Ligand binder design. Structure first.
Ligand SMILES: Nc1ncnc2c1ncn2[C@@H]1O[C@H](COP(=O)(O)OP(=O)(O)OP(=O)(O)O)[C@@H](O)[C@H]1O
Ligand SMILES: Nc1ncnc2c1ncn2[C@@H]1O[C@H](COP(=O)(O)OP(=O)(O)OP(=O)(O)O)[C@@H](O)[C@H]1O
Ligand SMILES: [Ca+2]
Ligand SMILES: [Mg+2]
Ligand SMILES: [Mg+2]
Lengths: 336, 319
């Protein structure tokens, strides 16, 4: 790759003597390191850096007008993934973005796994109905997969999704396009996300990744006195997930647990996301499914609320929803 | 990238079959390779031998080793459900206590957790057709409230042999949290030798109330509890047994009742709230009648049922 550059043979010979391979590891080093290794003066080092940088990044120029006008060339800025419920889609103004990590947080019985299953069902709908015509990847880190709930959801799919024409759903084979994986350790999860998910995404089998819990493996090994390795692992995992999502234009959804609050935007709230600010820096859209059980429970029905914590384009708001035999349904006319 | 089905032509199939596959919605090698057998053997214009050779030739290219939802629902008829001894509770739980999971029961005193554990320790030995699991039982005790006479009384109801029933139960007593964690290694070693169908811990959080005291020791207590629950999950997954644990309650004194009489919540916090799969909340009714409610479950709606504690164990309310 080095010989592709337009440069005099002297610097090419010096680079070859310096044990260099490609432009990436040329840009990896700095000025004084290159001076020490290659024994070159400043002007030619600057020229080599300039040429390698020009080759790597090309010479194209992009404006925001092109991003706005040309919808088809840039689907990431316009294409969204539906949640299967019009109320939830209205709350999210279309659904999940294709680039970046989305997080669900909440206590037990909030309804996170039901939403994950519903999204895994609706991802493979046709394009005009919000789907992506692709499979899904499901990773479990805490317990077994909800098989009966999945079977009921596939059975009820004609009842839940009524806008889609009836003659179109029978051709959709649901269970055959969902992949299930299971891990039991932080190292196992790292190896899985490193060398299994890219294989699935490369062949076009799936275009959606769901992790049923990221806090579960981490809350078992690292104590309160080992924050540095925990932060290193969290940063590596977030970087890899973001790289994969950007490369393959596939949404990533993470399910998270909560802790007890005993400066970060949480004052009038008793629970906060578990991992901390290090993991919170890696995210794009943050939601919070919450169930108010201690109060307004004597009315006979649970009170479930989904709230948008932060997003670059979504105002803080919340809506209400219920879980029934066919799936998750949002209550009309309740957006904050 | 994706591999189109055009490679099937050079793989040794005619144009008619690939045309039929295209008309059936199949358009890539991976989908055909990972398709369930019925989906491509029930179609028109195909045969069993053709489907078998198609699978054999497609598996060469696409790397296998990924589980799919169909190949996961078809294999799981192994899941056995153990009856609790009460028809109402069986109807509420839709069969009984599942295997390969963790079930938690919590409530105040004399609600009936120990009685239910005693009944299950006998009912797990019944033949599968009768509602059992055809195995032995482990009973890890942290309070000292194990009574074999209740086991004999329950065994007499089903017409079993008392000596054999008492022979097919293992017992251990835990005196602190370290001993409680240590016993699980021997539990796995013994599960390797024989066929066990149930494991019972009673209680799973009694010793954590007093081993770690004060706000200054909460973190270590939670870490220890999380490790213990992870060990339990590994055991249940590996050996395919049913794990049943019990829990205690704490009071809510912050004056947040607002028409909620005598509020109380289980101890252990979010760690035990997340680790468990199915949680049951036991209450008390009039006389010897109790009420069981579903607190949390991935595949069950919240409902209630009424049972009773009789001279022969957990059963149905008499009239
Ligand atoms: N028919 C039904 N089938 C299954 N669940 C139902 C049904 N109807 C209502 N539900 C509710 O669905 C909820 C499922 O909870 P879910 O598995 O989503 O919890 P979670 O937020 O993932 O919690 P955890 O941290 O334990 O995993 C239960 O609280 C249950 O009451
Ligand atoms: N032989 C019997 N006949 C009828 N009822 C009995 C018999 N033995 C015990 N009981 C009932 O068992 C009840 C106690 O239940 P159990 O031992 O399961 O309590 P628990 O929930 O485990 O309590 P703790 O939290 O104190 O450990 C008593 O209230 C009593 O009515
Ligand atoms: Ca749970
Ligand atoms: Mg869950
Ligand atoms: Mg007891």
């Amino acid at each position: 790759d080095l010989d592709l550059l337009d440069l005099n043979p002297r610097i090419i010979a010096a680079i070859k003597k310096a044990k260099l391979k490609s432009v990436k590891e040329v840009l990896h080093f700095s000025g004084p390191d290159l001076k020490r290794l290659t024994n070159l003066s400043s002007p030619e080092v600057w020229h080599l850096l300039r040429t390698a940088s020009l080759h790597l990044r090309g010479s194209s120029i992009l404006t925001a007008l092109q991003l706005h006008q040309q919808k088809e060339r840039f689907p990431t800025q316009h294409q969204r993934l539906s949640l299967g419920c019009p109320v939830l889609d209205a709350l999210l103004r279309g659904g999940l973005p294709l680039d970046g990590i989305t997080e669900l947080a909440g206590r037990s019985s909030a309804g996170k796994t039901q939403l994950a299953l519903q999204l895994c069902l609706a991802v493979q709908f046709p394009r005009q109905h919000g789907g992506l015509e692709a499979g899904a990847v499901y990773i479990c880190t805490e317990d077994a997969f909800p098989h009966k709930r999945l079977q009921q959801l596939m059975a009820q799919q004609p009842r839940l999704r009524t806008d889609v024409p009836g003659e179109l759903l029978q051709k959709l084979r649901f269970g055959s396009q969902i992949f299930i994986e299971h891990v039991a350790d932080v190292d196992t999860l790292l190896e899985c996300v490193n060398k299994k998910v890219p294989v699935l995404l490369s062949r076009g089998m799936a275009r959606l990744v769901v992790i049923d819990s990221v806090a579960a493996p981490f809350r078992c090994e690292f104590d309160s006195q080992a924050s540095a390795p925990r932060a290193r692992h969290l940063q590596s995992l977030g970087a890899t997930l973001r790289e994969l999502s950007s490369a393959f234009q596939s949404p990533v959804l993470c399910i998270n647990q909560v802790t007890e609050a005993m400066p970060l935007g949480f004052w009038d709230e008793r629970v906060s996301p578990a991992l901390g600010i290090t993991w919170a820096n890696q995210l794009l859209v943050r939601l919070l499914a919450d169930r108010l059980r201690e109060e307004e429970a004597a009315l006979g029905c649970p009170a479930r609320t989904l709230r948008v914590l932060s997003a670059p384009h979504l105002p803080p708001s919340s809506c209400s929803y219920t879980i029934s035999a066919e799936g998750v349904r949002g209550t009309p006319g309740t957006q904050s | 990238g994706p591999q189109p089905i055009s490679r099937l032509e050079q793989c040794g199939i005619n144009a008619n079959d690939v045309k039929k596959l295209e008309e059936a919605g199949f358009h890539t090698v991976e989908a055909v390779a990972y398709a369930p057998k019925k989906e491509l053997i029930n179609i028109k214009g195909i045969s069993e031998a053709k489907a078998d050779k198609i699978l054999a030739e497609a598996a060469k290219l696409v790397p296998m080793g990924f589980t799919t939802a169909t190949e996961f629902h078809q294999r799981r008829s192994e899941i056995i459900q153990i009856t609790t001894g009460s028809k109402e509770l069986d109807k509420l739980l839709q069969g009984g206590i599942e295997t390969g999971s963790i079930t938690e029961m919590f409530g105040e005193f004399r609600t009936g957790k120990t009685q239910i554990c005693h009944t299950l320790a006998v009912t797990c030995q019944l033949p599968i057709d009768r509602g059992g699991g055809e195995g032995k039982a482990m009973y890890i005790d942290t309070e000292g409230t194990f009574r074999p006479e209740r086991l004999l009384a329950v065994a007499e109801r089903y017409g079993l042999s008392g000596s054999d029933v008492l022979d097919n139960v293992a017992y251990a007593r835990a005196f602190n949290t370290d001993h409680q964690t240590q016993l699980l290694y021997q539990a796995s070693a013994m599960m390797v030798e024989s066929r066990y169908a149930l494991l019972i811990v009673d209680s799973a959080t009694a010793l954590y109330r007093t081993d770690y005291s004060g706000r200054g020791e909460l973190s270590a207590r939670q870490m220890h509890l999380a490790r213990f629950l992870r060990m339990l999950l590994r055991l249940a997954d590996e050996f395919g047994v049913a794990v049943v644990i019990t829990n205690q309650v704490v009071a809510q004194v912050d004056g947040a009742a607002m028409f909620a009489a005598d509020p109380k919540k289980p101890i252990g916090g979010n760690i035990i709230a997340h680790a468990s799969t199915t949680r049951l909340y036991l209450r008390k009714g009039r006389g010897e009648t109790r009420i069981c409610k579903i607190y949390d479950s991935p595949c069950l709606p919240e409902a209630e049922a009424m049972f009773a504690i009789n001279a022969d164990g957990v059963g149905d309310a008499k009239d």
